[PDB]
């Protein structure tokens, strides 16, 4: 789950 | 139920998390990119359109349908200030  | 989101990257980023991608299925059977968290006060929160469980179709020119997580993250991060997101809404 990448936070950008 | 495709909608368009035009946003402006805040200082803290676009303010959302993604999951999904070929080899990284978020839903069994589904290689798609999916929004899993809308961060309080961030660009995306303040615009109000983007939603958890949203599927990302495109970001600017870069289609996000059937791609690796890492390709999605790269494209999402290669973004300027002005961000166009094409999304699909659930069910």
């Amino acid at each position: 789950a990448t936070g950008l | 139920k495709i909608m368009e989101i035009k946003l402006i990257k805040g200082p803290k980023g676009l303010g959302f998390s993604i999951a999904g991608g070929v080899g990284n299925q978020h839903i069994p059977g589904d290689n798609s990119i999916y929004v899993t968290s809308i961060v309080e006060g961030g660009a995306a929160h303040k615009d109000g359109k983007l939603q958890i469980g949203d599927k990302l179709l495109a970001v600017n020119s870069v289609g996000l349908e059937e791609v690796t997580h890492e390709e999605a993250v790269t494209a999402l991060k290669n973004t300027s200030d002005f961000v166009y997101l094409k999304v699909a809404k659930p069910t």
Side-chain angles (χ1 to χ4, degrees), chain A, chain B residues 2-7 9-85 87-90:
Chain A
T2 321
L4 1 76
Chain B
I2 316 302
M3 75 156 292
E4 290 176 68
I5 291 137
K6 309 194 168 27
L7 305 179
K9 203 165 296 173
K12 241 200 180 163
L14 282 173
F16 71 85
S17 298
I18 61 165
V22 180
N24 195 42
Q25 295 194 339
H26 176 63
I27 298 169
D30 206 333
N31 299 317
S32 302
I33 310 300
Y34 283 107
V35 176
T36 57
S37 188
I38 298 305
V39 171
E40 201 76 19
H45 182 204
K46 288 203 215 272
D47 177 271
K49 292 147 188 127
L50 194 74
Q51 282 185 305
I52 285 172
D54 285 348
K55 195 223 256 189
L56 304 187
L57 303 181
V59 55
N60 305 331
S61 28
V62 199
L64 292 170
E65 284 203 289
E66 293 309 309
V67 300
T68 300
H69 192 64
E70 288 82 17
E71 294 189 351
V73 173
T74 278
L76 267 150
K77 293 204 168 149
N78 276 4
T79 46
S80 47
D81 278 300
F82 291 115
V83 191
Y84 172 74
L85 307 167
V87 313
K89 295 266 165 192

